[PDB]
Structures are given as structure tokens and as C-alpha cells.
Amino acid sequence: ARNVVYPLYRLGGPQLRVFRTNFFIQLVRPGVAQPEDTVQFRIPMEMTRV
Amino acid sequence: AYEWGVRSTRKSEPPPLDRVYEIPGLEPITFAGKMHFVPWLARPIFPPWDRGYKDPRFYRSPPLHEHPLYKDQACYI
Amino acid sequence: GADRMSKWTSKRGPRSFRGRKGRGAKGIGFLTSGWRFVQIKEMVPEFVVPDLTGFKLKPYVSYLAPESEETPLTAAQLFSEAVAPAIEKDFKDGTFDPDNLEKYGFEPTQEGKLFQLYPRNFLR
Amino acid sequence: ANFVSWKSRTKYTITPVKMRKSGGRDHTGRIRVHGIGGGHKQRYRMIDFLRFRPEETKSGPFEEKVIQVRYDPCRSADIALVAGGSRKRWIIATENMQAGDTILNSNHIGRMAVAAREGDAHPLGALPVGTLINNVESEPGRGAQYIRAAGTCGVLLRKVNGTAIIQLPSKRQMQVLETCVATVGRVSNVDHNKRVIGKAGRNRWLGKRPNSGRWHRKGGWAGRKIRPLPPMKSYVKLPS
Amino acid sequence: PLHKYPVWLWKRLQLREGICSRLPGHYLRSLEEERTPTPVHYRPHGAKFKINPKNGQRERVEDVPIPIYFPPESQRGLWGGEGWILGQIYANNDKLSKRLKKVWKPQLFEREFYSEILDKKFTVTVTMRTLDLIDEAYGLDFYILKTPKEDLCSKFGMDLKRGMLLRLARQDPQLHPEDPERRAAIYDKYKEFAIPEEEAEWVGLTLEEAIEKQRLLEEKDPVPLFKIYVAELIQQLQQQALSE
Amino acid sequence: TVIVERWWKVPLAGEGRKPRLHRRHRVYKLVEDTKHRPKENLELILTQSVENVGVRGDLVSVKKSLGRNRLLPQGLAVYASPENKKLFEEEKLLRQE
RNA sequence: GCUAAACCUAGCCCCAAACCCACUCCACCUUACUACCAGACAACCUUAGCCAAACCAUUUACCCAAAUAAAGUAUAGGCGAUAG
RNA sequence: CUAAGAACAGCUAAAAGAGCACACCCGUCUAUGUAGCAAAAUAGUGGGAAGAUUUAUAGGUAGAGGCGACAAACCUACCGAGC
RNA sequence: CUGCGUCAGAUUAAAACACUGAACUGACAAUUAACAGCCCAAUAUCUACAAUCAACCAACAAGUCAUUAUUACCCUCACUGUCA
RNA sequence: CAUCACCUCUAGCAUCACCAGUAUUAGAGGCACCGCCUGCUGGCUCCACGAGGGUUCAGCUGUCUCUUACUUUUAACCAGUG
Ligand SMILES: [K+]
Ligand SMILES: [K+]
Ligand SMILES: [Mg+2]
Ligand SMILES: [Mg+2]
Ligand SMILES: [Mg+2]
Ligand SMILES: [Mg+2]
Ligand SMILES: [Mg+2]
Ligand SMILES: [Mg+2]
Ligand SMILES: [Mg+2]
Ligand SMILES: [Mg+2]
Ligand SMILES: [Mg+2]
Ligand SMILES: [Mg+2]
Ligand SMILES: [Mg+2]
Ligand SMILES: [Mg+2]
Ligand SMILES: [Mg+2]
Ligand SMILES: [Mg+2]
Ligand SMILES: [Mg+2]
Ligand SMILES: [Mg+2]
Ligand SMILES: [Mg+2]
Ligand SMILES: [Mg+2]
């Protein structure tokens, strides 16, 4: 999630879980030729590939 | 003899304690409750702190004499 | 000749400046010796997605619905709906004491809880 | 200025320590000594000027064997690497010192004088009168500070009541206790003052910058003006 | 435009609201008072009227104090109200000669004193004036207790007063625990300076220190509404049973 | 103590009002430095025998460089407070009786 | 007849009155607007000068808490300029 | 000035603040230009080009001063005292 | 810091031109990490012998590169730069 | 101007410059190598070197006697901008 404070993690701590996410992605058509399996999204800056 | 390490490069002496601590039966008023430094309040004396859990990235070894494999006789390696 | 009224981002500056500045994404690990990054599984936020099979509710609401007035939830309202019914039953029975408030649902301290209320240690 | 002295090492070692030049600048960043700047990079080799420093597990007189006499950039004189027991340290080499020689370091003061050998360290109370000495100390445990430069040598003029008169290379007498440890003989690089720089470029190799081009009419006598007394003020200058 | 209040009144206006208004009443009196300190670096006239020699008339005279600069190091000792005098002088004491900046500094000594109430010795920096004042007060403890705040001119001097007053108020047995008779004797000598513990705990504190002290007394975790509502619910239920 | 005086007269302010100081009112002239005045003798009541006087309760006067340094820190003497005199007066009275 | 020319509001000024503002989430003293590791660094100190004195060198007005009046008086001052 | 880096063909020579001569640095003479391409440039001709060299990066010294192989030079295109 | 990619434009001055006119306006599109940057548990303890093909030889201006002992530790490829 | 070389002056010592140094050193200066001569500091000679300032042999050439021809830019005219 974005614009929220992530709880700090230390060794042996609980798993970080998010139940409601505010990340909204949008599928877009690539402007250039792409491989068949490749899919292009627009994601918020705070979002990682993981 | 000539000591190695000029006093400027060594850690400076901590500032002298405020005179409020020298008066018995007197509780100093410090900035420990404000959680930040201010010049017009006494400097609190913080007790030593322990992390409370084992962290490999921030581990500090015990003193050398406290190591289990410590012998008075030296071994040349 | 530099633009001082534009947003300072990771795309500006030399190589050391560009790699040190980010975009706001939270860190999910740390760097070890040899510039090797170690990703911590517990630092990666895991999505708790429920099963939506056989779910009645839908994104929109039909217009053929009454215009109910809005009643914001308050602490006093929640206490009466949840805790008050239990206390009344115990009050009539005659077994009531402040020592047993933990049994009614009261939490004297937030330590030792997976989801602490203040300060909260969970995401939205 | 954010000036931190490189002299931060606290443990002695024979490893050459990298040092940063000052350029005549103090901690503030302004020039305090002129004509200093640039030159070839140098690594400082720590010198133990306290010749009598017995080991932690040892005491009393001990002996050291010279390993190598080499060139030191920091000082005019050469230095020698010696090994005594299980340690090695740098000392100031004498004029006649080679690899393999054995030097003696003692704090013993006998009833009579002893045969003084060049490079050995004995107290001033056990050295014959007139013997050339170098690397003297003001008081015991102070360390050698005087007669360090290449070829310099002092003179043991006299010894009376536990004190000795040392003739410094500047022909000045100095009185110190007879228990001060000194090194017998002259210092290495006797012909150091006989060198020729050859060109202005070699002075820039030693970290010395050219002098200011201003014509200073001021000097020891020219700049300082004796104030004429009112009676003598009339005779200061006479037209001719 | 104009301000509602003069600018010089804003300092006393901030004491009307906020945590300052919640400070004890006796403490607020000690700050708003402007008692004139005892003259040190100038000779007072001694009378309200004098006869001007030139015209032989009875003219009014006033004592105008000379500003005194107290260095920060003066707050860790007992200078007796002395301090650096930042002023000008005329060369050769001639008005027609040029004017030069002159600073007069007191002579400081690191003398040691012993306090009977605190049973502890201090190595403080004092002037020759402070030594004379302790001699005229017949002991360090009397000097600290008699000398007012504007005359001590030292934060350490006011801290000693607060410490001494608390021992005279709390009747703390920490003073000579092995000699109860001696402890009573010391408290019976300074009995003229008895101050209640409530008022003796704010003596010498500055405005910033008092604000911090008051905030600590007001610092508390908010009461959960569960306890509040349960108290309301039980009280309501008890009243309900009465009607039945 | 440096005691100084203003070269220039300060005009009267009145009752309840602060005087108006000018740039010229910062010019001072030294009147007297109390460090150069003749010394005085501190009056003390001795508790133990000393070389000057060996009688307890006998009022003595010595230089301030002696009472402050030796007599008072060592407990040899006490300040000549009026209350102390009354207490020692009773002690002397018991000796006579 | 082109370029142009005309317009009346926006708002502002001076008073009176009354003592003003700053937590929606997130980020912000490190290279501010940068989630996340042993610090110990800490504040306070006369204003000067231009200018006037036909130079300049002592000196030269600067709200200090009630409008008026006492009064530009007593005083101060290279007993000058001026200050009060 | 400090820190830690980089650059210098070929040839004659020799372990050279050597010679010739590119890159590079500098700017001797002449001409063009003079609101110009340019608030100092252009073309040709020149001095140096393994060294007291040239140069990129970061840091330091600030105006009652700094710095200066003294030209009263320079300190952000008016420095006998910056803005 | 999007600054001759695409499309459209009552378009229309880049020191001339311009319909496709285009180094103008609007919209849309884009530069994908392996390269580079962002590194490291503690406490002690170690590190005399240049470089120059480093072997000759010859130097001074004396130099640009090293650990071990014990304790702790076995989770894994994120982030940012990428156009003209 | 600086410059090796020479000379004068100052300083007997350490924990931020000098310096992690110690009178064969450091600083403040003069002069400008060397060689010869001199006093008890002064004057000549000389190797190379110089975008320094003069002079000169020979050659060279439109520098000139005495200018001329051609090419390019400019130029003038046409169009655009201005
Ligand atoms: K004038
Ligand atoms: K030349
Ligand atoms: Mg700008
Ligand atoms: Mg010189
Ligand atoms: Mg000169
Ligand atoms: Mg009045
Ligand atoms: Mg004038
Ligand atoms: Mg004039
Ligand atoms: Mg050459
Ligand atoms: Mg050449
Ligand atoms: Mg230069
Ligand atoms: Mg000149
Ligand atoms: Mg001139
Ligand atoms: Mg400028
Ligand atoms: Mg990589
Ligand atoms: Mg010259
Ligand atoms: Mg001629
Ligand atoms: Mg000819
Ligand atoms: Mg022809
Ligand atoms: Mg035309």
C-alpha cells in the first residue's frame, strides 16, 4: 500500500500482511512491437515488481 | 615517552554534568521527557541500553577474556 | 542556470546521486558485503485476498433503494451495541467486578497482540 | 574548516602510514606557514625515539640486531629497522650502521665508565666525557628530541652531581640529568648538507614552494627603525 | 494597522494562556516581580534630594543602575551579583580625548565551601564580594537563603536554595542518618526559612524549567472510554434498580 | 569590585518610569576598585586552642586569609553571630558556676 | 482608414475595532520534502557609521509605556553645533 | 592548497626542469573583426609539449579578509579593496 | 530534462522558405539490467622490501593496491540511472 | 618576478600549522648559478639559453622603382527576412 506507514520489521518478527491495498494498475497497449507473452501495465511509483 | 594519537583526533571529553545533580535530595529537570535536545534544560543521564534480541547485522562480541577458548598461555600461530 | 523550482528526483545528479535517491517504494531487504542484496520474505507485504466465489455484493447498487440517513459510528454507540448487552446480563445475575473487565473484552495493554491499536503495527 | 589531523593512529607499527599534506594550512584552513605545498607523496614511518623501551614480558638491558638501514622521506637522516626479541621498530640510524650489526640498550649506570660503541643506548651517567652523542632527552622517560638531524652530534662536556652538560650542535650548553638515555656517535647522512639541489624543480619535489616575489625592504635591521632621541634627532641626516 | 496590545506586553500575555496559566500562583508572582538588585558596581546617593552646588537648590536625585553582563560561566558559581561591565572610557580621563571601549572583569577564585544542610562540599568559582557576603551572613547556608533571586544572579545559587529549602521542609532524615540529634540541631537553626514543600519545589526554576515541570505533572495516558462508559453504565444500571 | 560612575548626567525619569539611557551614557569612569582597599579583620569565636589564642569561646580577630582558609574549614572557629555569642555566653556562665 | 484611441472594476491606502494563524492521509535538518541502527556539536557578549558642527578629532535628537501643562524651563555641551 | 585519479604519438638521443615534432597548454607577430561568430574571437605565423607540465572530480582559505614565482595580479565578464 | 518519434492543428516566423507545413501548439507514445549506482557483524591483532614488460642494470623525488584469532551468521537478486 | 648557488636574521622545542619535525633542522629575508677577484662586503669573465632590444653578410622576394592580371569573399541588381 501507498501513503501508509509500514510497520518496522526485526529478526523473528511476524509476516507483513496487507488486507486492503490502494494500488490500482491499468493495462495499456504498448506503443512498440512486443513479444506475445509480454504484458504492459502502468503502476504507481510506490509499487515494486515483487 | 611520546604518545601516539593527537588529542584532537581522540574522542572529546563529555561536557561536565550540570550542577543540579550535585545537590542531594534534588530532582533535576531534563529534556528526557521532551525526547529531544534543548539548551535551557539539564542533560539527562541515560542508563545503558540493550537491544533485547540477537541481530546478526548489529552483533557485538563479548570481551576477549569472556571468550570460552581463552587461555593465559599464548599460542603462536 | 539550474532549475531550483522543479522537483528533485533520482533522474538528476551524478551516478552516486541517482542510485541513492528512490521513488517512494518501501525497502524489502538490506545490502550485504559484495553489494549483494538479501531480500527478506517477511518484509514483503503479503496480500490477503479472500475467495469471491458466490459473493452477493456487487460494485454498484441498484437505484431502487431507500434513502437511509447517514449515522456515523461513535465509541459510545459501539459500546452500547457490543459490550453493554453482556454487562446487563451479568449485572442482573449479580456477578460483576472490575477485575473481570478483561473477560468482557477490554484489553488493559496492547503488548503481546498481533494487531496493536496504538501505535498500530499493521497496514491498511 | 573540516580539518582532521592524519596523526590519529594510536598503536605503534613499522608499517608505513599514509599521511596527508597540509600546504602550510592550520586547522582553520588559512595559511600559517608559507612556502609549503605539493611535492612527491610520502608515507610516514613511525620512529621510536625512546631507545630503552624493554618489552612487556622483559626488563633491564636488552639487545637489538639491525635488519636494514633505509631512506626516510620525512627526516633528513636515515632510519634503521631493528629487531629485539619478538618485536621490530624503527630507530634513527647512526653514521656507521649496517645490516647485521648488534646494538645494546641499557639503563644501567656502573661505578666506572664503559666502552661506548656507536649506535648503543646508555645513560648519560655511564658515558665517558667528550664522546659524541645524539638523540638526547631532557628527562628520563621523555624521549629523544634534540640532535636528531643528519650528521648532528652533541658533546658530553662534563658530569657533576648526577647532571651532565650537553653541547648542542648550535654550540649551546644544556644541563640534563645523568639518567637520560643517549645514543653514542653521530647520526647517519653526514654528507647530507653537501647535496646540490641542481634545479628549481627539485625544490618543488621536496614540497617547498617559491618565495614571494615582493621586494621586502623590511629585515632584521632595515625594517626595524631605531627611534632617534630628540637631542640626536637633529644629527640624523645632513645635506651634502 | 496597530496591535491590540503593546509589544512589550506580549511576554506577560503568554502567561495568561497555555501551560503557563496552569502554573502555581506563587510561582507566577516570583517572575512578574521586578525587585531592584542591590547596588554593586556603583555608589548609591543615599538620599532623595541634594543641593546642587552651582545654584544652591534642592534638586531630586535618582539612582540609575549600570547594566551588568553576566557570562554563561557565571551561572555555575557565586559571583555575588558581580559581572562584566561593558562600557566606554575617555583616554587619560579627558572628555576632549577619544573614546575607547573598556571591559572590567571581576577577580574569580575557586574556593571551597561546606553546607550544613546538604552535608556536601562544593568547589565553586566566587569573587571577593561573595566571600564577604558569606562572612556577613555567618555561613553559606544563610547567604543562600537570605539573598534574593535578583541578588544571587546565578542559576546554581538558586538551585542550592531549592535544595536547601526542600530539606528544611520535608524534614528529610537523609541529613546525618546516624546522628538524629545533630540532624535536629541543624534544622532548628534555619527554622526562620521554613517554606511549604508545595512552594519550595518551584524556587529558582526558570520559565522554561517550570513549563517542563508542569507538563510532566500533566503527562498521563488518556483514560480508555471502556472504563468511562462502564462506570456510566453501572451507575445508570444501579439507578435503574432503584426505580424497580 | 570595580565601582564606576557615568561621565554624563542621566536625566530624571520620574516616579514609576525607567530612565532613558543614551549612547553617551555608556561612558563610565572608574571611581574605586575595592580590591585595593585596606584589609579588614574577621571576628570569630574559637572552638579549639590555637597559637594566637588557646581559649575556647574567646572572640578573636585575624586576617580574612586565615579564618576563611584555616579556622573555618577545619572547625577551629565559628562565625561571631549574635546567636553564637549568646550560646557561648551561657557556656562561659556554667564554667564560672 | 490603418495603427490605434476610449471604459470600471479588480483590488488597494489610512483609521476604528478586536490580541492572530498553523494535526486529512504520506514525506520533510542526509543531497529538505529521502519508511527502517551507538550519538554525545550546542544558544546568550556595548552596535557602528553616514550625517550636523559649513573640516574634523569631544559631541550630534531616535516611542519605552497618561494626552495636556510645567517647558524648550532647570540642567548638559570643542559651555560650539546642539542635547534636555 | 588538500584528497584520490588521468594524459603526453613518432624521431634523435640519453637514465636530461634535453632537441625536433602531434594531441594538448599557452598567446609572439601580422591581418581580419570593432553592436563582431565572439562584453577578447578568427586565419596564418609562433613558445612549451616527461615536466616548476597539462587536466577531470570533491574539499579548504571570504572582504578590517583571502590568495599571490609582487602584475597593486586574482577573489563569478567595472577589485587601489567583491557583491 | 523530453528539447526534428507518431498524429492532428483556426496552425503558421525558426533571424530565407515551407503544402507533407515544422527545431510551433495540443494529444499520444517511450528509455525494460546482465552495465552503472546503492555495499560490509563485533573486538582485538597484523601490513620493513615501489613502479617502470620487472628480468637485467640504474636510481630518488622513496612511492598507486596484503591479514589473522575468536565470537556472530547459511535469509536471497529489491531499489534507482537508461530518450534526443 | 621566480630559480639552483651564495648570504643575512630568528629559534634549544612536541600531541591540530611549523611537525607527528629538532640547528646538516625550521622560519623570515637579500641576491641570482658556477669560476675569478675583494672586504674582514664589492668588481669582472664566461657555457649554453631568449617569440628580449639593436646591428650585419648572403640569399630571398610586388616591400619598393611601378604597379598589373586572375580567382574567391564582399560588392551591385532580383526575391525573402530585417
Ligand atoms: K566633509
Ligand atoms: K625572451
Ligand atoms: Mg536560476
Ligand atoms: Mg629564498
Ligand atoms: Mg626577491
Ligand atoms: Mg512628570
Ligand atoms: Mg561635517
Ligand atoms: Mg574634506
Ligand atoms: Mg624538453
Ligand atoms: Mg621543444
Ligand atoms: Mg602562479
Ligand atoms: Mg613592482
Ligand atoms: Mg605600480
Ligand atoms: Mg567581479
Ligand atoms: Mg550490476
Ligand atoms: Mg631578478
Ligand atoms: Mg640601418
Ligand atoms: Mg642584404
Ligand atoms: Mg599583368
Ligand atoms: Mg533586398
Q: How far is the CA of D207 from the centre of ligand 4 (A)?
A: 14
Residue D46 sits in the same domain as residue D120? no
Provide the grid cell at E136: 556577613
Q: Write the CA distances from D44 to C53, D25, D76, integer angstroms.
A: 78, 19, 13
Q: What is the DSSP letter of E29?
A: H
Asked which of D54, D88, D106 is the last residue of a domain, the reply is: D106
Side-chain-side CA neighbours of A46 within 13 Å: the count stands at 12
Distance CA D148, CA D75 (A): 9
D40 sits in which H/E element: none
Residue D130 sits in the same domain as residue D81? no
CATH code of the domain containing D167: 2.30.30.30
Q: How far is the CA of E47 from the centre of ligand 6 (A)?
A: 20
Residue D182 sits in the same domain as residue D131? yes
Distance CA A14, CA A19 (A): 15
Provide the grid cell at B74: 599464548
Residue type, D225: K
Q: Which of F39, F32, F92, F57 has its CA nearest to residue E135?
A: F39
Q: Which of F73, B23, C78, D3 has its CA nearest to residue E111?
A: F73
Residue D51 sits in the same domain as residue D81? yes
Asked which of D147, D163, D187 is the last residue of a domain, the reply is: D187
Residue D49 sits in the same domain as residue D112? no
Q: How far is the CA of F26 from the centre of ligand 8 (A)?
A: 30
Which long-range CB contacts under 8 A does E87-93 form with residues at least 24 apart?
E87/F4, E87/F26, E87/F27, E87/F28, E88/F26, E88/F27, E88/F28, E89/F27, E89/F28, E89/F29, E89/F30, E90/F7, E90/F27, E90/F29, E93/F29
CATH code of the domain containing D25: 2.40.50.140
- Chain CA centroid to CA D37, Å: 22
Q: Write the CA distances from F93 to C33, C85, D82, E156, F96, integer angstroms.
A: 90, 87, 85, 43, 5
Residue type, C14: P
- Alpha-carbon distance E219 to nearest alpha carbon in chain C (angstroms): 17
**Structural domain contains residue D207:** no
Residue D101 sits in the same domain as residue D113? no
**Structural domain contains residue D27:** yes
Q: What are the strands, taking DSSP E only, across F1-97?
A: 2-6, 28-33, 41-46, 59-63, 77-79
Q: Write the CA distances from D204 to B59, D25, D35, D122, integer angstroms.
A: 50, 17, 10, 40
- Residue of chain F whose alpha carbon sits nearest to that of E65: F19
CB contact under 8 A, B9 and D141: no
What's the start-to-end Cα distance of chain B, in Å? 31
φ and ψ of D25, to 5 deg: -95, 135
Residues of E in contact with B41 (CB under 8 A): 208-209, 212
Distance CA D36, CA D38 (A): 7
Our count of domains for chain D comes to 2
- The dihedral built from the CA positions of residue D195, D198, D204 and D205, taken in this order, carries a sign that is negative
φ and ψ of C75, to 5 deg: -65, -40
Longest CA–CA span in chain E (Å) reads 103
D218 touches strand H (CB under 7 A): no
**Structural domain contains residue D51:** yes
**Strand J bases with any atom < 7 A from protein Cβ:** 1-5, 8-18, 20-32
**Structural domain contains residue D35:** yes
Q: What are the strands, taking DSSP E only, across D172-227?
A: 173-177, 181-184
Q: Which of B64, C37, B29 has its CA nearest to residue E217?
A: B29
Residue D2 sits in the same domain as residue D81? yes
Distance CA E77, CA E110 (A): 9
- Alpha-carbon distance C114 to nearest alpha carbon in chain E (angstroms): 20
**Structural domain contains residue D213:** no
**Strand H bases with any atom < 7 A from protein Cβ:** 1-4, 17, 51-53, 59-62, 66-71
**Structural domain contains residue D239:** no
Distance CA E126, CA F2 (A): 15
Distance CA D172, CA B39 (A): 55
Strand partners, D88: D83
E237 sits in which H/E element: helix E225-243
Residue D62 sits in the same domain as residue D146? no
Question: In this complex, is the C-beta atom of C88 within 8 Å of any C-beta atom belonging to chain E?
Answer: yes
Which domain covers residue D124, as residue numbers? Answer: 107-187
**Structural domain contains residue D63:** yes
> How many CB atoms neighbour CB E226 within 10 A?
17
Closest ligand, as measured to the CA of C19 = 15
Task: List residues of A whose CB lies inside 8 A of any C CB.
Answer: 1-2, 4, 6-7, 9, 13-22, 45-48, 50
**Structural domain contains residue D44:** yes
Q: Which of A45, A43, A38, A40 has its CA nearest to residue A28?
A: A40
Residue D101 sits in the same domain as residue D139? no
CB contact under 8 A, F3 and E135: no
Kindly give the interhelix angle for C75-93 and E225-243, rounded to the nearest 10 degrees: 50
Place of cell 512486443: A34
- Smallest CA–C1' distance to H57, residue: C14
Question: In this complex, is the C-beta atom of C43 within 8 Å of any C-beta atom belonging to chain E?
Answer: no
